[PDB]
Amino acid sequence: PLPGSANSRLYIPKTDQNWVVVSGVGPEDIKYGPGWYPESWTPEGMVPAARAGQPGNYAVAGHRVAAVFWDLDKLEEGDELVLEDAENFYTYQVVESKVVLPNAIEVIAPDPFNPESTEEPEKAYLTLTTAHPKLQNSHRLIVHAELVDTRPKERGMPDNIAHMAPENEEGLEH
Template sequence: MSKRPTVVSVLGELLITVGVFLLLFVAWELWWTDIAAGREQESVRNEVVQQWEPDTDYEGEGADPAVVNGSGAWGFLYVPRLGAEWSVPVADGVGSDVIDRGLMGRYDVASLPGEEGNLSLAGHRQTHGSILWDLDQVVEGDVMYVQTANGWWVYRTVQNHIVAPTQTEVLDPNPLDPGGPASGRWLTLTTCHPLFSTRERMVTHAEYVSFIPTSQGPPEAIADAVAKNGTPELEPQAAGRT
């Protein structure tokens, strides 16, 4: 004669079922979203490179004509501190349709490469590619590069700090003088902090150093990452820049 289920046994089975679903959700959030974002990145890399048409007359003065507001994916970010082959595509927008694809997104208030102001970008630190997982390893003096069809914008890190989500002044035209006028050309990266939390934001500011045209070949520090992206090359004049 079979036993009738008790309240305790039914509750136990429900808890087990809920636990299994929670584990599956965590696995999807931490594992599958990274895989999906990685696949999406590869697709975007190919699209970016195929649409590039370098302007050989542009020498880095004024807004980079290769980047048009609202035009989607337009370049790559390289941070050697995060790995010799580390790079991530950059696109306009910071909504889920951009950063959940494992891309760096440019805020709509941000300047364009080459403009006075703050080229501010956002990306996930965990899930959806976890592209900025190791951003806390970036220190003052580290060099970062933003590549467009026309060349590489070189920036040197001056600050890596933690702020509240409400401190949007980190996106100001001069992030080291919030509220003041644009002064200089800046690159700012933002991501969530601490890991597995959205309680705070980790923010890295870097100051413009130089521009290297595509015709001169990639900087030595990111040559492997550039080659991995399959970026079309013009006839190099002076490869091995830093």
């Protein structure tokens, strides 16, 4: 189909939250909820970002507001984040939460732990970004997580997100 792109869903057990993640991080894109950065940063230029569950860095921006990323500071090392595509649930575990300046575009590099890399990535990360401190725009709060499990959707939802029901049965795909 034309178009034939897919969206994803993000689930956070710790804060009991979930969203459909749209494509893009412009102001209209993330007005109402989180959005995926379509390109990753490298020193040689922007490159296509990892799709959900895939090697590289799937990065998501959301506003620091009640219905979105206000409570991102509650995440700690070890906490799970689940990303869903059309085929799988991908469970990532938080490996770092930190504060950076707003120009720290390196945090969306394919390997945020090696942003100067000129190699194709091997590990799959998830990064969440939002304004910080609360009610300020001076910094960004960054959560990085690493993939620990890939579950085919045929096996049903992970127990700890199975109560997070959608409003409709429309797919993440056309």
